[PDB]
Amino acid sequence: NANWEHLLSLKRQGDTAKRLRIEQDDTRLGFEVDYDRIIFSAPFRSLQDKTQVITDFVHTRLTHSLEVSVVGRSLGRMVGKKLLEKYPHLEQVYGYKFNDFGAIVAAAALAHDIGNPPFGHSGEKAIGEFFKNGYGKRYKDSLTAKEYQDLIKFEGNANGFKVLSQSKPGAQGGLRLSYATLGAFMKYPKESLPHKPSDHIADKKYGFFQSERALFEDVAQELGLLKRSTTDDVSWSRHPLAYLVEAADDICYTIIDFEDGINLGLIPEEYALEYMVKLVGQTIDRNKYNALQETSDRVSYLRALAIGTLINESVDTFMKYEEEILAGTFDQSLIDKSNYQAQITDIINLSIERIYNSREVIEKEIAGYEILSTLLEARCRALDNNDTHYNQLIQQLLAPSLYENLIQICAEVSTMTDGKALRNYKKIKGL
Amino acid sequence: ANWEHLLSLKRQGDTAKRLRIEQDDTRLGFEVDYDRIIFSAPFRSLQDKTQVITDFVHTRLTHSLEVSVVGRSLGRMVGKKLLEKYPHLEQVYGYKFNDFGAIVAAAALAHDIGNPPFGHSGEKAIGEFFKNGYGKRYKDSLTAKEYQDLIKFEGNANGFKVLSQSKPGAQGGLRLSYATLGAFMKYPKESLPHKPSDHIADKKYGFFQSERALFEDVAQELGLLKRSTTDDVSWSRHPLAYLVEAADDICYTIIDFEDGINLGLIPEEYALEYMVKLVGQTIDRNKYNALQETSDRVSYLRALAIGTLINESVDTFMKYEEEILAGTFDQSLIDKSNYQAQITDIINLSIERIYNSREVIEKEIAGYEILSTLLEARCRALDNNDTHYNQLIQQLLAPSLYENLIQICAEVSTMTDGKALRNYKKIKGL
Ligand SMILES: [Mn+2]
Ligand SMILES: [Mn+2]
């Protein structure tokens, strides 16, 4: 069974001595510094020019990441305060405070989208398609089964972990986030294989590439995560705070996708109160709602309330199943146990029908397949014959072990802004 | 002046006091303020608002987030020292060091939220419209202060308006805590008199006549010191305003320099030359030399210089803490820095190579045309709301005379750079 004293590790990669919570300066608390390191990092700043499914210029992945980190800070503060009541020795002996849990969830949430390719899950699938059926199929017999699985099922979560921890000359350990933050980041503590060994949400995807396996082994050992398999296919039970990072993300994309689609016209405004009345009625001020004269103001009032309702419930679900999560025996997400799962489901379904299957979004994702394939092919052909005049040009333009080279090409194409990607694609194509 | 009152948790419309000891620690009013700004439409609109350069990767949103991060750190470090200097603030009123960081962080997060597009040129295009352009005609129908609001339109005062604008069903706007609004107020003065002293608090003004009564309520709750010797009102800065200003000062000095270097406008060699004193005692030379990319090298130096400037600003603040509390502090915290010469060399280099570059002058020249055109259409429709064309302009751009003109200026100010150009193009047929 896992221990909250080890799960709240302040260790950073390469540390030679232990970091005790009591001995920290509260003005420079490890977990809070993690948040700043992310805000100021080049991968986070690049989210300015990375659009979500809809490209209205005011629907960015930076805003999503920001709002997920805010909701995440709330979730972790409230759970953190209840956990210190249950296990008083964590504050009495180890010096932990409730804002520590707030900070861990907030930093992991803030970073949760940092490694995703452009164009959504279509972007991930364009990359996988490239190595499964495109030019990149040629590498299959030179890679291990799990190196190849990293590629053909390329996963933005796992690319995220690489962005946060990648060593470079003069920058060992990447952003060097606290291990507790890295533990909460990891929604899927498993390798690419075996694929979907169970129906648990933690088994649905994978969380780290082969290139990062040794790194997460260090994190998992320090946190004391529970070994879920020892069959040479490593996987662990989720760090408890990872459920809150997931819940914050789930809450935001459920409610705020709905809001956005109402504002963009894709969802008639009538559905707003219809799908959300159960989630708001115990807290809504009817007088205030009927005075608001603008649709955007009405639906954002409803969204603030729906999000408040879901945070409060998610805290309760965590505390109820707290011992099962600590044992690694909790099989669902926090949101899967919500009493509003009927309402959440109808919301998600309407959002899919009217937004994610809208003609604009389908078009952006189809063009994304072509943009990502073209960039991957220019990179891989340059890797294969670095001697030609053209491939040396391509090398100066796009990038000035075989598996490490391929995964790095994937990481770099994935972290390109939409601006650099399209401009470089157009250049390659003569447009 | 008393830190008990300066740290007020009041929200607009309140009928009873808000005791710090009775706040829920997971719903603290100062931290709620941050989240309200983060989720607000005006803050989201900074996504499509460019700063000096249009690279899509230098937005007013990223600047606002980084100023707020540097402000949280300042508020935090200063807060602990204030609480150790004034222990009754914690043992009696229940304030905590994280409270100062939250106030500074919220005020800093919002500090650019009312700024017009196209930078300081945007502000001057709005003023010229009312001083010598079409808007000149209203001068005889407005008090001196009402007109001065227009001819010297100020992004800072527009930000206060945005944070507090009442609308049906939304009294008080974001309803931020009064301590946060105090921390936001860099220029607690009205548009007149114009630059009374050479003090930075008097270089600009901070609230329009439309918001004068709101800030009067704020200044009274917080117990700010009236420094005005006339009917013209003026207050000494809320002490935390010095930290909000310092966070902004540190970020635009160092990060503009970093941006200019990474963009290509400033040669790389100037990085170490201009920042060696700011980083000499904390830089790891082997780490630096091991960094291969210039971007990563300048990021390292930027993090180091900000670290030095934050520490020095905290020390400066506590050194002059009683003078700031008494409203007798005459400078910015960064004005008192030992690296004033390095800072000035850095600012003057950025001015020469970034702010006067051809690409920035053209954007500003174009910004003038865009803002003047939108202002004239809205004002002509205000004057003759009866014609078919002016009703059309009313539906597209906006679906008491001073109230109407200050509103038109606020709306033109908060338009994204994108909406400004598109609406400008429709008004011109493209
Ligand atoms: Mn997300
Ligand atoms: Mn600024």
User: Could you tell me the radius of gyration of chain A in angstroms?
Assistant: 22 Å
Largest sheet data of chain A: 2 strands, antiparallel
How large is the count of helical segments of chain A? 21
Q: Name the pair of protein chains with the most residues at their interface, and give those residue counts.
A: A-B, 41 and 42 residues
Task: Enumerate the strands of the largest sheet of chain A in spatial order, edge to edge or round the barrel.
Answer: 1-2
What is the beta-strand fraction of chain A? under 5%
Gross morphology of chain A is globular
Q: Helix fraction of chain A?
A: 55-70%
Helix and strand element order of chain A: HHHHHHHHHHHEEHHHHHHHHHH
The kinds of small molecule bound in this structure are: manganese (II) ion
Count of extended strands of chain A? 2
* Structural class designation of chain A: mainly alpha
Oligomeric composition of the shown chains: part of a larger assembly
Q: Termini separation of chain A (Å)?
A: 59 Å
What do these coordinates show?
The structure is cut from a larger assembly and holds two copies of chain A. With 431 residues, chain A is mostly helical. Helix content of chain A is 60%, strand content 2%. The first copy, chain A, is built from 21 helices and two strands. The first copy, chain A, has helices at residues 4-7, 30-39, 42-45, 61-86, 89-92, 98-111, 121-132, 145-152, 156-165, 179-185, 213-223, 241-264, 270-280, 286-291, 295-320, 322-326, 341-356, 359-384, 389-398, 402-415, 418-428, and strands at residues 227-230, 234-236. A two-stranded antiparallel sheet of chain A has the order 1-2. In chain A, strand 1 (227-230) and strand 2 form a beta hairpin. In chain A, helix 4 (61-86) runs antiparallel to helix 12 (241-264). Chain A is globular and about 70 Å long. In chain A, 48% of the residues are buried. Residues 63, 67, 111-112, 248, 252 of chain B line the site of one manganese (II) ion.
